Amino acid sequence: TFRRLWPTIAPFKAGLIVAGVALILNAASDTFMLSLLKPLLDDGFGKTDRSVLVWMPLVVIGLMILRGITSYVSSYCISWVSGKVVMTMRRRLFGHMMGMPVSFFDKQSTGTLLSRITYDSEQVASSSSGALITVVREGASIIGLFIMMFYYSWQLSIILIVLAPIVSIAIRVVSKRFRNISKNMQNTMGQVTTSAEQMLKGHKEVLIFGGQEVETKRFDKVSNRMRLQGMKMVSASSISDPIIQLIASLALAFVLYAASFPSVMDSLTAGTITVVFSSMIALMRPLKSLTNVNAQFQRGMAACQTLFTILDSEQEKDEGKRVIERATGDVEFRNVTFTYPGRDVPALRNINLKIPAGKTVALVGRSGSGKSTIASLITRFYDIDEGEILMDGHDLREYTLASLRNQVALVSQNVHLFNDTVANNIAYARTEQYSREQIEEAARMAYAMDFINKMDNGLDTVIGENGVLLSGGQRQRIAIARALLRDSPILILDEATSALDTESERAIQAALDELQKNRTSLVIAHRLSTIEKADEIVVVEDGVIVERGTHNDLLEHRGVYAQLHKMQF
Amino acid sequence: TFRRLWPTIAPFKAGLIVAGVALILNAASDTFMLSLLKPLLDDGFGKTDRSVLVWMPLVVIGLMILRGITSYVSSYCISWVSGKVVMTMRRRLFGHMMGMPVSFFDKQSTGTLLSRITYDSEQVASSSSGALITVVREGASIIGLFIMMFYYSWQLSIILIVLAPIVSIAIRVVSKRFRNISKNMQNTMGQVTTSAEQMLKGHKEVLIFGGQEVETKRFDKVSNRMRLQGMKMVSASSISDPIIQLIASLALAFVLYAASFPSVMDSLTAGTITVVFSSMIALMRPLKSLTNVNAQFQRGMAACQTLFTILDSEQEKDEGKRVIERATGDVEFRNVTFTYPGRDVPALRNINLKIPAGKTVALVGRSGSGKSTIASLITRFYDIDEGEILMDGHDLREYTLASLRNQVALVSQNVHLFNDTVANNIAYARTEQYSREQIEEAARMAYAMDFINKMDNGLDTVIGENGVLLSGGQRQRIAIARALLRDSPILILDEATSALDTESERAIQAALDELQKNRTSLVIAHRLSTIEKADEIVVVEDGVIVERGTHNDLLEHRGVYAQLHKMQF
């Protein structure tokens, strides 16, 4: 429709200009090929001299060489412009990906966001490249062949370009009329076959009454009706092709009789008629390619505008300005109601949860997964619909999102591994600040050191995809090591791995216990031992608290703690 | 295999042969058009302004007119051959199909059996016509074009037909080389899209750990990898077209440089070169049409063997030569096990039905299976698997089938009415035997006289499909009137009409009583009055008999009929 992509093809534009120059060569080279047909017939084979026909093969070989180099450099420079625009468009899209909110990542588009970031961007790049290729190459071919036909024999060019649309609309009206005849006769066949179904019910009603011969005569009559109807079908269908070919050659007869009647003619010698005939025979293809230009361009800018509304979605709401280096204050829920966007059911109703600093708080009692929201609220993955959660007496909306995300650590079994070293994956965004010996120490306590000895390069081995594909318990150990490196004041772990490694699960629990000796920890518990280590347990069924207290208080008051001990046993 | 249909085209093959007299000429005309390219260039505008340029437009007009008439008569004569072969094929298929058993028609494929009559045999005729046209038209085109080759410029023709396989194998090997370069190529950027998938997947961890800048910096490197891989793709796919045009025009330059030899020219003359190049560029199409000849033959002849499987298959087993004139004898079932072919469960266990002469026997079973085929075993629709049914002490297998089906009358609401007149519908297959006054006499006790006078014509109107159409009880009244005209000794009824006609359904029962006043009557019943009108009652559940005897005897004994009776209420 309308491009604001012109600034983001601004620094590469001259390269496209060079590309355009190549296409200005390219079709013109083809034009010269058609011009090369002129000395062949009039001078080369016609006259008895050999001199034009030794001029022929080197010149046509040079033109083909020049067409080859100009096509290579045309596609190379259009690939440069398309590649650099998909470079900067992909980079700007991914830059507006990582600060943009999580609500697009709620199973709206996960695998097709790869399509949005890759396939749509190469689609608009290739569409603009092919659109420029089509427009400028077939435009150069059209204007070259037009100036060719006007230069060599302008009169016959004029009358033959006059004769092309009248025979074209003659083909159109003949095809329309015969298509009307065809569809009416398809209806007539419909009628002839509705009578043919009657014989198939006939079969049963024939053998029950012994009427094979009378049904044979009636099928003879109706099948003669099919034969006559099909005779008129194939006659009317195959009368089309001689008619269209006859009116098409009426134009050829008009040109050839028109080479004699206007007695000022005969300006053409021998080869120029072959030149202009091959000119329109080879010109019928650029016009057909130019008809699809607006459709290709509209599809490409449709993909571009889809990518533009992908870019047009805003980032996080970062209206807060409270920068806090160390958030040792208590996080406290105050009647917070939160709803999933696009879902009518409220994901969380009003909750007065209290998390003291240092004291370990557990969260149990889920129906489905009600704690998945709660693990995300303090990190502010999702915005709160109503209510306030206070840290240091301050709401998270008052906080900056960067510092608030800095004070939170997240450890889980599904921790995805970046395609970097082990020491880089432990130390995301802090590798420059932390010394490598500190990553080694964090590995020492995290009890993952034996496994870091296991790969070849030690702490510098790649560990993500197309790497070692490290075990999920060791992925958990990696996440604990990240937690010891960050030393965030709060802790949140799902523990819903449900797979216990031989003596490595005990090391995982021990490393988590060293990690949670200091600072607070809000734990989603699947291990029963982690319920014993919990100082506080808050039982929330979906969005409402069932119970709040220490585990010996629910050892007497049953509630749904009996159901929790049931599904733990 | 091959054909075995030549006798089926043998009386009409002369209409094929004159078609060939068209077809070769249709291609000869095209050859003559290319022959017209020789005096138009050399003897045309170069030498004389006049004379020849009166000849060429009129000759082109005459050749195109002749092409039109020969294409019209070619299509009409091949339409004659295809219409006559589909004529005799549909006649033979239907005439064999009428005696062919109902066991194929029990929902194997009833919708496609109309296609087996029309579409499959039309595919056979159209494929044979297309195969013959594709052989002989482009065969004469190839032969005439090679005659044009060897008549004009012998040396250039022989070297050009030498050079065309060389450029063909060269274009094949370079296409194969660039293609498996592409299939070797296309995995490497897919491995980069895996890294992009992991990078966009780690959005949550990039948010919580605060690593947007590092992910942007690494996305720059991986997107540079995508740009380089796309560069290599576009370069590798781009370098094909200069290579293909370079090798094609290398072949063209070979022809031109070999034409620079003075031995070859001096026979090539002024013109005579455009006809040869145009002969190859026209040939590019008949050879491509001829290479599909075996596929076009084989698809249609596979359809022909499929139809020949239906044409030669099974028939009625009619090893009984006992003609029966009047079936006054009692129908007696005796330990008769019948199973539907292709079905696991036996549809009928060993039952010993007795049908005494002039006595009403009623089948009132509610099972929905097993008893409906009893109405088909009496007509020998399905053959006996075990046991014996004897009529007048004689088995119906030992009876003549045609006389037996003469002895059966069938009345139901599922009766099919033919496309003939309603007078021909009542007296169907015996309208020569019975007079029109006898048909009106049968209509008198049929109580259908008001519906006959309701029609536009009266007694001789058409009642079937694409006709006046008839109500369901009035469609039954055709079958009661057909029963009075046939006066068969046995009755077979359905009684599934839950809907009852106002003041005519009781008249339908009155006409049925008129018919049942004499002779045997086996009735399938659901209406209570049909049960009360029974002389004898036999109720069958699944394939087994549960109660035999009159309505009073089953009115005393509870058994199975009483709960059936309460279900009827």
UniProtKB/Swiss-Prot annotation, chains A, B:
Biological process according to GO: lipid translocation; lipid transport; lipopolysaccharide transport; transmembrane transport
Domain (ABC transmembrane type-1): residue spans on this chain: 16-299
Entry-linked SMART domains: AAA (SM00382)
Reactions accelerated catalytically: ATP + H2O + lipid A-core oligosaccharideSide 1 = ADP + phosphate + lipid A-core oligosaccharideSide 2
Function per UniProt: Involved in lipopolysaccharide (LPS) biosynthesis. Translocates lipid A-core from the inner to the outer leaflet of the inner membrane. Transmembrane domains (TMD) form a pore in the inner membrane and the ATP-binding domain (NBD) is responsible for energy generation. Shows ATPase activity. May transport glycerophospholipids. In proteoliposomes, mediates the ATP-dependent flipping of a variety of phospholipid and glycolipid derivatives. May also function as a multidrug transporter.
ABC transporter domain span: 331-567
Knockout or disruption consequences: Absence of MsbA alone causes accumulation of hexa-acylated lipid A species and glycerophospholipids in the inner membrane.
Keyword set, alphabetical order: ATP-binding, Cell inner membrane, Cell membrane, Lipid transport, Membrane, Nucleotide-binding, Translocase, Transmembrane, Transmembrane helix, Transport
Organism listed in the record: Escherichia coli (strain K12)
Binding site for ATP: 365-372
Assembly behavior: Homodimer.
Regulation: ATPase activity is stimulated by lipid A, hexaacylated lipid A or Kdo(2)-lipid A. Inhibited by the phosphate analog vanadate.
Impact after mutating residue 77 to S: Does not affect ATPase activity
EC number per UniProt: 7.5.2.6
Source lineage: Bacteria, Pseudomonadati, Pseudomonadota, Gammaproteobacteria, Enterobacterales
Record text about domains: In MsbA the ATP-binding domain (NBD) and the transmembrane domain (TMD) are fused. Substrate binding induces conformational changes, NBD dimerization, and stabilizes an inward-facing closed pre-translocation state that binds ATP. ATP binding fuels a relative motion of the NBD domains. The movement of the NBDs is coupled to reorientation of the chamber, which binds the lipid substrate, from cytoplasmic-facing to periplasmic-facing through large amplitude motion on either side of the transporter. ATP hydrolysis is then required to resolve the outward-facing conformation back to an inward-facing conformation.
Mutagenesis or variant effect for residue 495 to Q: Lacks cell viability and does not support growth. Can still bind ATP and slowly hydrolyze ATP, but becomes locked into a closed dimer conformation
GO cellular component entries: ATP-binding cassette (ABC) transporter complex; membrane; MsbA transporter complex; plasma membrane
Name under which the protein is recorded: ATP-dependent lipid A-core flippase
Cell compartment(s), UniProt: Cell inner membrane
